[PDB]
Write a protein that binds this ligand. Structure first.
Ligand SMILES: *[C@@H]1O[C@H](CO)[C@@H](O[C@@H]2O[C@H](CO)[C@@H](O[C@@H]3O[C@H](CO)[C@@H](O)[C@H](O[C@H]4O[C@H](CO)[C@@H](O)[C@H](O)[C@@H]4O)[C@@H]3O)[C@H](O)[C@H]2NC(C)=O)[C@H](O)[C@H]1NC(C)=O
Ligand SMILES: *[C@@H]1O[C@H](CO)[C@@H](O[C@@H]2O[C@H](CO)[C@@H](O[C@@H]3O[C@H](CO[C@H]4O[C@H](CO)[C@@H](O)[C@H](O)[C@@H]4O)[C@@H](O)[C@H](O)[C@@H]3O)[C@H](O)[C@H]2NC(C)=O)[C@H](O)[C@H]1NC(C)=O
Ligand SMILES: *[C@@H]1O[C@H](CO)[C@@H](O[C@@H]2O[C@H](CO)[C@@H](O[C@@H]3O[C@H](CO[C@H]4O[C@H](CO)[C@@H](O)[C@H](O)[C@@H]4O)[C@@H](O)[C@H](O)[C@@H]3O)[C@H](O)[C@H]2NC(C)=O)[C@H](O)[C@H]1NC(C)=O
Ligand SMILES: *[C@@H]1O[C@H](CO)[C@@H](O[C@@H]2O[C@H](CO)[C@@H](O[C@@H]3O[C@H](CO)[C@@H](O)[C@H](O)[C@@H]3O)[C@H](O)[C@H]2NC(C)=O)[C@H](O)[C@H]1NC(C)=O
Ligand SMILES: *[C@@H]1O[C@H](CO)[C@@H](O[C@@H]2O[C@H](CO)[C@@H](O[C@@H]3O[C@H](CO)[C@@H](O)[C@H](O)[C@@H]3O)[C@H](O)[C@H]2NC(C)=O)[C@H](O)[C@H]1NC(C)=O
Ligand SMILES: *[C@@H]1O[C@H](CO)[C@@H](O[C@@H]2O[C@H](CO)[C@@H](O[C@@H]3O[C@H](CO)[C@@H](O)[C@H](O)[C@@H]3O)[C@H](O)[C@H]2NC(C)=O)[C@H](O)[C@H]1NC(C)=O
Ligand SMILES: *[C@@H]1O[C@H](CO)[C@@H](O[C@@H]2O[C@H](CO)[C@@H](O[C@@H]3O[C@H](CO)[C@@H](O)[C@H](O)[C@@H]3O)[C@H](O)[C@H]2NC(C)=O)[C@H](O)[C@H]1NC(C)=O
Ligand SMILES: *[C@@H]1O[C@H](CO)[C@@H](O[C@@H]2O[C@H](CO)[C@@H](O[C@@H]3O[C@H](CO)[C@@H](O)[C@H](O)[C@@H]3O)[C@H](O)[C@H]2NC(C)=O)[C@H](O)[C@H]1NC(C)=O
Ligand SMILES: *[C@@H]1O[C@H](CO)[C@@H](O[C@@H]2O[C@H](CO)[C@@H](O[C@@H]3O[C@H](CO)[C@@H](O)[C@H](O)[C@@H]3O)[C@H](O)[C@H]2NC(C)=O)[C@H](O)[C@H]1NC(C)=O
Ligand SMILES: *[C@@H]1O[C@H](CO)[C@@H](O[C@@H]2O[C@H](CO[C@@H]3O[C@H](CO)[C@@H](O)[C@H](O)[C@@H]3O)[C@@H](O)[C@H](O)[C@H]2NC(C)=O)[C@H](O)[C@H]1NC(C)=O
Ligand SMILES: *[C@@H]1O[C@H](CO)[C@@H](O[C@@H]2O[C@H](CO)[C@@H](O)[C@H](O)[C@H]2NC(C)=O)[C@H](O)[C@H]1NC(C)=O
Ligand SMILES: *[C@@H]1O[C@H](CO)[C@@H](O[C@@H]2O[C@H](CO)[C@@H](O)[C@H](O)[C@H]2NC(C)=O)[C@H](O)[C@H]1NC(C)=O
Ligand SMILES: *[C@@H]1O[C@H](CO)[C@@H](O)[C@H](O)[C@H]1NC(C)=O
Ligand SMILES: *[C@@H]1O[C@H](CO)[C@@H](O)[C@H](O)[C@H]1NC(C)=O
Ligand SMILES: *[C@@H]1O[C@H](CO)[C@@H](O)[C@H](O)[C@H]1NC(C)=O
Ligand SMILES: *[C@@H]1O[C@H](CO)[C@@H](O)[C@H](O)[C@H]1NC(C)=O
Lengths: 235, 232, 603
């Protein structure tokens, strides 16, 4: 996918991995003590059997699931946003309920949701996370990657990718010359923006056209307008 | 360029078959046949895969990319079944002995021999370096794993009349014009955590009907035990 | 004189040369002892050089089967400009045994032939030097031995008939395999690997007892080019006709061509066929030109596995080619992609129409199908799908059920995989059923019920003004924000404490509800415990103390009673005077503040 870098231990405590059938299929974020926020597209068609989903909290390396800092958990309830379409790829955000609960620790922390009428200005650098690949396809990296990419306004996003509706329900991040992206390969985590002195769940990894290609913005699911829906299930 | 599969979807295929240490590959300059690691010095492969020089790859994650997690041991001796009808590919099974003892780790390990014959509807797994491309005449380097239950004897015989014998059983189900288990010429057939068969042939690249025909290995208890004992 | 590893000294021990140079046909030692027959003691027959016109040789263990791996090499030398023809009657062995015929001697050899477990037939080498390398790669009892009969012939006085005609029974005849190809042609008796690809019998003989040439049958996965070359043809005063039989069977057949080449560099193609032509031997007819010396070739492009192309029964005649009695070959019909697009089928149905197959549920459903079912009911009536039978693929095939009557449809449930599935209840009087299919593994399908009615999924409300939770359990007063687990949904334990007229999101006045009425609270004394209790009730993080502003409200205030267990006790008894509004202040829970000392990478 190009653009990844090394991630320190505990750098992203709210990034968790989702395993279905023994393989890392998608990613999620830790918001509360019993709920996760993940992409609805990658969990579609597998919500009838939540027992087959393995939620790994505090994961740092693909083949090092032995440290005590990582506490595996199961998923019992899976809910998908009713506004999802699967044809326009609109509102690809779904929530997964943990088995019982998770104890807060240094390497496992929640992430604050955006408040009402809180929009991150475009052009502000934000971090991305996920267990993506170095090349466009294949050769999955065993170490969590991190990169900084400024937000792209939807006005130019709808023109740079004249294939979707985009509308106001998506947030685009990318570069004019490309190089840094997280849309394809594997989500493995959401889009995080930090203002004041704390990160926020600004976006969730979504579909895309190409990785490390110029004039190919990376689409991310907008969470500012979905704060109420998430908070309805958080408590 | 747009693709049929996108949006962080791997297509349901395992990430290079994680936690699958019984997968081995046969190399003679390129990948041509697969197999299963019976023990530290024995593997099982189809009889038609016989070649003058074969290199055994243990715990391979990519055919072209090497990350230091692969073991390369040259073959020392290859033993083929003495009753092989190439016209019908019956008894399509052979054993290859590695020159040096394998190193058992998280990516290379042995698999227990079957003890009971499989039954219809048994959940089974098929492993191999098959194609995972919806369209295009290209060979991907991804590692493909699919699940397919063993079918009934009557249906398997009727699928390919005049070719199915008592030592053959069908794993693939239904039909489909897209990628499937297809061939790979010796892909592992592990049902309920135990090896049960070896890929032999099929109706093309899953053109229609059953994707392929698999050679049962349970019947050759003597050929899989006494031969190994006498060729130690 | 000491020699480095990988090299061996000569008999005189004066010069060190490569180990492979010994007994290879190249004289490198000063005394010429490297080619001595006694020095090259192969033990097979005691001889190494065969300078005679004709002869034969034996292998190790002549009277008894061999039991030890022995390497033997033989070199035959004849007059310059003459070729050697190797003829074999019947050869068998224990798999691992290759004669390893090579072109010439020394380091210039590449490969000539390699036949194991089968009779090679007849092998012709167009050189004055022929080399063989007997090898054993097994410790078992292999074959008794190998022999070869050869005879010298001029090979340049041959006419066009002998050069061209070859039915593939006496080996490859005089055809020379190209040395600039990815792989060489293979002559295999009977049927070969890759079922439904390649001939099952020989054309010349009629059954499996015959021999034919074809592309390599190994289960490879790479594109390769194979080629066969012939001797130059002498000029003729009459045009000639070239006849051959080609069998191009397989789904991945790329191209077959002749590509006649001449000494004038005016190469041209006279025959070219592409694609599959069925499991039948087709007749190829070629007219000849280019009286000057030219070579007839058969360039075939080999694709991945299941792309076998075979040739047999090459013959030559004279005169203009007659009318081809055999009909011109035609390509296979091929499964036609007749624009699957979207079948559509039924779209809307009403109450009289309830039972319906999906598309062809008894048999299967078509691939690439996007079927839309519009379930319309009367006003005020809900719709219950009540699936009867459901058999999809697993994760690819998905049945999507949404709520209609609006542009922004609301997803209700997603069903996939085998086995029965639960019913679906729609919010309004319209349900949309979507079937997304894939191009592979199309199961039988699904069948619905289309049940409609009033309050299909809504339980009967409780009487006597009793509150009801989501699970339907009756909760009159017991679990009205009292902190219990009567209903697993938790709706009966909804937050009865909230802010009112505050400055920000985490700010507000006192507002506590006991059962169904919101009211203020008494906080004349304030400590850390009550602040923590308020924070816990509001679901926030750690908080601190707060102070009132002015007693602007004199309504029915309710005192707050704390407990050592953290539970808040509400006493509806205003035993106080001059009540004042109290501001509730708390902070949010600890979020993902960065702690690791991340480095800086300006890249
Ligand atoms: C018989 O085999 C020989 C050797 O394999 C083969 O000769 C090769 O032919 C190809 C194409 O016929 C040549 O490739 C060409 O190279 C030139 C110069 O680089 C290009 O301009 C060509 O491009 C165009 O070629 C055609 C016009 O001539 C166009 O119709 C076409 O659409 C392309 O736009 C092409 O790439 C190659 O150089 C030779 N190799 C040699 C001469 O060594 C020959 O074609 C075969 N068939 C015969 C003789 O019938
Ligand atoms: C080569 O392939 C040809 C297929 O196209 C075969 O037929 C003829 O071959 C020649 C030369 O290769 C072609 O070129 C023409 O030949 C004519 C012949 O002229 C004759 O008639 C005139 C007038 O009566 C007379 O003056 C001449 O002496 C000849 O008797 C020339 O006149 C042309 O200029 C041109 O060079 C022909 O086109 C071609 N077809 C025919 C119908 O002639 C040929 O047999 C092949 N060569 C072999 C097999 O050696
Ligand atoms: C759901 O069940 C319905 C059962 O009532 C199915 O209705 C069937 O529809 C077909 C096709 O329309 C009918 O076959 C013909 O229908 C025409 C309709 O005539 C129309 O035009 C005249 C013009 O004067 C008008 O007066 C009528 O009111 C109609 O608007 C008839 O004229 C023919 O004689 C013939 O009957 C069936 O009769 C009808 N009923 C049944 C029991 O088949 C409906 O098709 C089902 N839904 C789906 C998707 O198939
Ligand atoms: C995750 O958090 C929960 C909640 O704090 C932890 O449960 C609590 O664990 C402590 C220490 O193990 C318990 O205290 C001890 O309990 C035993 C009885 O098991 C008692 O005999 C001791 O005198 C002492 O009180 C505590 O009871 C228990 N429950 C609560 C409600 O606090 C849990 O241990 C944490 N897990 C991890 C892995 O950190
Ligand atoms: C947001 O991120 C972008 C990168 O994605 C930042 O742009 C970077 O800005 C620095 C300046 O501090 C550039 O460094 C420059 O490098 C040249 C190399 O010769 C050097 O001569 C200059 O003196 C300077 O050090 C860096 O190249 C540039 N990145 C790219 C890709 O061009 C941007 O500053 C970030 N903004 C915020 C607010 O974090
Ligand atoms: C193998 O057979 C070929 C015949 O294809 C022999 O080649 C032929 O050798 C004769 C010599 O006896 C050549 O005749 C001479 O040709 C030259 C022109 O190069 C001419 O000036 C002389 O007056 C004489 O006629 C003949 O051209 C040559 N080629 C053919 C096609 O006949 C070859 O010598 C034989 N090799 C042996 C017997 O080792
Ligand atoms: C094309 O078909 C013919 C006929 O099968 C093949 O051989 C031809 O055989 C006849 C018989 O010896 C040759 O003599 C001809 O006989 C007929 C009938 O008696 C007579 O009417 C003619 O005047 C002539 O004498 C004939 O020359 C010979 N060739 C042809 C063209 O008829 C021939 O081999 C087949 N192939 C080719 C490429 O011609
Ligand atoms: C879904 O469709 C199935 C059939 O396609 C419906 O099953 C049928 O349901 C009716 C009642 O609505 C049954 O009739 C009653 O059966 C009971 C015995 O179970 C009998 O005691 C009553 O006197 C009456 O005859 C009918 O037998 C049953 N048929 C089958 C094959 O199960 C089902 O009701 C539909 N679901 C709905 C409408 O919610
Ligand atoms: C006590 O609860 C109230 C409820 O909001 C808060 O008191 C005041 O909060 C403001 C925040 O805008 C504080 O201003 C700044 O606070 C930071 C620490 O967060 C401090 O480093 C700055 O120098 C500045 O003062 C204000 O100090 C604070 N006042 C008091 C008396 O607390 C706050 O949430 C709670 N106070 C504490 C210390 O937690
Ligand atoms: C399979 O193909 C072979 C190819 O050789 C067929 O062999 C044919 O055999 C007949 C037999 O005629 C006679 O058979 C005598 C032995 O019983 C033998 O001593 C005698 O010399 C003579 O050959 C022969 O006429 C044909 O010429 C042979 N075919 C060829 C192409 O030469 C054989 O019949 C085919 N079928 C089977 C079932 O093997
Ligand atoms: C997203 O889809 C909507 C669908 O309604 C598009 O709305 C179109 O708006 C124009 C402007 O008036 C109308 O002329 C069209 O008729 C509308 N579409 C339809 C189907 O009615 C909207 O433009 C789309 N957004 C983008 C960025 O393409
Ligand atoms: C909001 O940003 C400020 C940036 O200064 C954060 O850090 C404060 O820094 C000052 C330095 O003068 C310290 O005295 C304060 O104690 C720091 N914390 C606070 C709360 O004042 C500040 O932390 C950020 N807000 C948050 C979420 O703490
Ligand atoms: C990897 O696992 C080992 C287990 O021994 C542990 O010591 C180490 O800290 C782990 N590393 C990371 C980065 O989690
Ligand atoms: C090799 O030996 C076998 C058995 O004697 C014999 O049939 C065959 O003729 C010999 N080789 C050749 C050149 O035929
Ligand atoms: C809101 O403001 C009014 C103004 O009098 C006050 O009386 C009331 O108490 C305020 N809020 C609460 C929580 O009571
Ligand atoms: C604060 O006032 C309430 C009002 O009844 C009382 O219950 C509580 O005990 C008081 N707290 C003290 C006296 O510490």
């Amino acid at each position: 996918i190009v653009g990844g870098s090394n991630a320190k231990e505990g750098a992203w405590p709210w990034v968790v991995g989702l395993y279905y059938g023994g393989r890392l299929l998608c990613g999620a974020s830790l918001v509360s003590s019993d709920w996760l926020v993940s992409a609805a597209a990658c969990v579609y068609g597998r919500n009838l059997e939540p027992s087959k989903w393995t939620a790994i909290l505090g994961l740092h390396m693909k083949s090092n699931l032995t440290s005590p800092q990582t506490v595996p958990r199961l998923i019992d309830e899976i809910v998908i946003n009713p506004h999802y379409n699967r044809r326009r790829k609109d509102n690809a955000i779904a929530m997964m309920h943990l088995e019982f609960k998770v104890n807060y620790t240094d390497y496992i922390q929640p992430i604050c949701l955006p408040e009402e009428n809180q929009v991150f200005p475009p052009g502000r650098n934000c971090s991305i996370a996920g267990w993506g690949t170095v090349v466009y396809q294949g050769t999955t990296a065993n170490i969590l990657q991190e990169a900084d990419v400024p937000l792209l306004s939807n006005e130019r996003c709808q023109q740079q990718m004249p294939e979707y509706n985009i509308t106001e329900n998506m947030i685009c991040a990318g570069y004019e010359e490309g190089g840094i992206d997280s849309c394809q390969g594997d989500a493995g985590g959401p889009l995080m923006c930090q203002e004041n002195n704390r990160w926020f769940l600004a976006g969730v990894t979504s579909f895309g056209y190409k990785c490390a290609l110029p004039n190919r913005p990376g689409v991310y699911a907008r969470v500012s307008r979905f704060t109420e829906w998430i908070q309805s299930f958080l408590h | 360029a747009p693709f049929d599969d996108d949006d962080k979807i791997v297509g349901g295929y395992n990430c290079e078959e994680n936690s699958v240490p019984y997968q081995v590959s046969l190399n003679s300059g390129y990948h041509f046949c697969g197999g299963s690691l019976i023990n530290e010095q024995w593997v099982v492969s189809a009889g038609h895969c016989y070649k003058s020089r074969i290199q055994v790859r243990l715990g391979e994650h990519n055919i072209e990319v090497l990350e230091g997690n692969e073991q390369f041991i040259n073959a020392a001796k290859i033993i083929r079944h003495p009753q092989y009808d190439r016209k019908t590919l019956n008894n399509d099974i052979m054993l290859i002995k590695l020159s040096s003892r394998a190193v058992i780790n998280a990516r290379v390990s042995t698999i227990s021999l079957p003890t009971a014959p499989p039954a219809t509807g048994t959940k089974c797994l098929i492993s191999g370096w098959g194609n995972t491309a919806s369209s295009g005449a290209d060979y991907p380097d991804e590692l493909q794993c699919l699940d397919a239950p063993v079918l009934s004897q009557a249906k398997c015989e009727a699928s390919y009349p005049g070719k199915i014998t008592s030592n053959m059983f069908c794993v693939g189900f239904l039909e489909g014009g897209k990628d499937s288990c297809q061939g790979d010429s010796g892909g592992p057939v592990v049902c309920n955590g135990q090896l049960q068969g070896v890929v032999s042939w099929g109706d093309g690249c899953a053109q229609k009907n059953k994707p392929g025909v698999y050679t049962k290995v349970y019947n050759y208890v003597k050929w899989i035990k006494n031969t190994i004992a006498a060729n130690s | 004189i000491e020699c480095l590893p990988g090299s061996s000294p000569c008999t005189d021990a004066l010069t060190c040369i490569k180990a492979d140079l010994f007994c290879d046909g190249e004289v490198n030692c000063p005394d010429g002892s490297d080619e001595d027959n006694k020095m090259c003691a192969t033990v097979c027959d005691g001889r190494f050089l065969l300078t005679g016109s004709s002869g034969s040789f034996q292998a190790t263990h002549y009277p008894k089967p061999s039991e030890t791996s022995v390497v033997c090499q033989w070199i035959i030398r004849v007059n310059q400009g003459l070729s050697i023809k190797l003829s074999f009657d019947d050869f068998n062995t224990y798999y691992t045994d290759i004669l390893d015929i090579y072109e010439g001697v020394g380091s210039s050899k590449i490969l000539r032939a390699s036949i194991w477990e089968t009779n090679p037939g007849t092998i012709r080498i167009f050189s004055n030097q022929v080399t063989a390398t007997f090898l054993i790669e097994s410790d078992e009892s292999d074959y008794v031995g190998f022999n070869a009969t050869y005879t010298a012939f001029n090979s340049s006085e041959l006419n066009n008939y002998e050069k061209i005609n070859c039915n593939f029974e006496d080996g490859f005849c005089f055809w020379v395999q190209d040395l600039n190809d990815d792989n060489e042609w293979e002559r295999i008796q009977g049927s070969t690997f890759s079922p439904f690809t390649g001939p099952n019998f020989d054309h010349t003989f009629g059954n499996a007892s015959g021999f034919y040439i074809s592309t390599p049958t190994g289960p490879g996965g790479r594109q390769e080019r194979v080629g066969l070359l012939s001797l130059p043809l002498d000029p003729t005063l009459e045009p000639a006709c070239l006849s051959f039989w080609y069998h191009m069977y397989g789904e991945n057949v790329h191209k077959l061509s002749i590509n006649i080449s001449n000494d004038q560099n005016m190469e041209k193609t006279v025959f070219q066929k592409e694609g599959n032509y069925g499991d039948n031997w087709n007749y190829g007819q070629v007219t000849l030109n280019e009286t000057v010396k030219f070579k007839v070739a058969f360039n075939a492009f080999k694709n991945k596995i299941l792309s076998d192309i075979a040739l047999d029964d090459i013959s030559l005649t004279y005169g203009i080619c007659n009318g081809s009695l055999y009909p011109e070959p035609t390509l296979v019909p091929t499964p036609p992609p007749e624009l699957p697009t979207d079948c559509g089928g039924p779209f809307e149905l009403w109450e009289p129409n309830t039972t319906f197959s999906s598309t062809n549920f008894p048999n299967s459903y078509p691939n690439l199908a996007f079927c839309v079912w519009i379930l319309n009911a009367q006003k005020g009536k809900n719709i219950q799908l009540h699936f009867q039978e459901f058999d999809l693929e697993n994760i690819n095939d998905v049945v999507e059920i949404r709520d209609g009557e609006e542009a922004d449809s609301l997803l209700l449930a997603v069903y996939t995989g085998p086995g029965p599935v639960k019913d679906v209840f729609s919010t309004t009087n319209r349900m949309t059923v979507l079937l997304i299919t894939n191009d592979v593994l199309a199961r039988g399908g699904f069948k619905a019920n289309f049940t409609t009615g009033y309050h299909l999924g809504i339980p009967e409300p409780c009487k006597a003004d009793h509150f009801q939770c989501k699970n339907g359990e009756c909760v009159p007063l017991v679990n009205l924000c009292d902190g219990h687990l009567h209903c697993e949904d938790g709706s009966d334990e909804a937050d009865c404490v909230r802010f009112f007229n505050g400055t920000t999101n985490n700010n507000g006045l006192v507002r506590f509800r006991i059962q169904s009425i919101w009211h203020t609270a008494c906080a004349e004394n304030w400590t850390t415990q009550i602040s923590n209790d308020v924070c816990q009730l509001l679901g926030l993080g750690s908080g601190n103390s707060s102070k009132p502003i002015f007693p602007t409200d004199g309504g029915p205030f309710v005192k707050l009673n704390t407990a050592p267990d953290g539970h808040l006790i509400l006493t509806p008894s205003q035993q106080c005077l001059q009540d004042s509004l109290i501001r509730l202040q708390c902070n949010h829970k600890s979020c993902g503040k960065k702690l690791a000392a991340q480095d800086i990478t300006p890249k």
